[PDB]
Amino acid sequence: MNIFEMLRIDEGLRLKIYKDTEGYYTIGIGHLLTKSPSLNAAKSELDKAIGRNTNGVITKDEAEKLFNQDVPAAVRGILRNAKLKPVYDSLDAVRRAALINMVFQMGETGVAGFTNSLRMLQQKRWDEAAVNLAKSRWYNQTPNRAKRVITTFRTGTWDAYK
């Protein structure tokens, strides 16, 4: 297991434009296209991103292409965020994958606000952080996914994805 497989499990893979859990235009392996209610807008974004007229449909290779850009960018944003970097740096490999997963799903900003849990993580107080993480909109909305991520932080293993 690794971050790529982890995320592929959590986000799925769809070749036609679709609405995510929040109702936003998405494609591929959880590649957000736009937050606008317009399918025209998202198509336009899709075309810009792929570099061709897609008509709202990409190939599997194109989806992995976006995925390959998206994963590293997530990491890069964490390393640039003053709130996140120190947590990420204190963590072990498996647990960093859990943080990236969150950042990938909700963005830096989304995550930068889990202050209290981040602090707990940094302190390596696993069970407590796990508890605190669950007290969130995130958990109430995507409980199954949140649970997998939470187990990962709590245990430091890939047990939840296996």
**Residues marked as catalytic:** 11, 20
Which C-beta is closer to Cl ion: that of 49 or that of 84?
49
- Name the residue with tokens 């849990």: 117
Instruction: Return phi, psi of residue 159, to 5°.
Output: -45, -45
Give the one residue of 95, 145, 148, 154 binding Cl ion; rule: CB under 5 A: 145
Q: Binding residue per annotation — 40?
A: no
Instruction: Report how far apart the first and last C-alpha atoms of the chain are (Å, whole number).
Output: 9
Which C-beta is closer to Cl ion: that of 57 or that of 86?
57
Sheet with 25-28, strands from edge to edge, namely 14-19, 25-28, 31-34
- Judged by phi (left if over 0) then psi (alpha if -120 to 50, else beta), residue 58 lies in beta
Q: Which stretch binds Cl ion (CB under 5 A): 57-65, 116-124, 140-148, 151-159?
A: 140-148
By CB under 5 A, how many residues form the interface with Cl ion?
4
Regarding 53 and contact with Cl ion (CB under 5 A), the answer is no
Give per-residue burial for 125-134: e unless 16+ CB within 10 Å, then b: eeeebbebbe
Q: Which stretch binds Cl ion (CB under 5 A): 1-9, 47-55, 96-104, 107-115?
A: 47-55
Which C-beta is closer to Cl ion: that of 145 or that of 154?
145
Regarding 142 and contact with Cl ion (CB under 5 A), the answer is yes
Interface residue list for Cl ion (CB under 5 A): 49, 142, 144-145
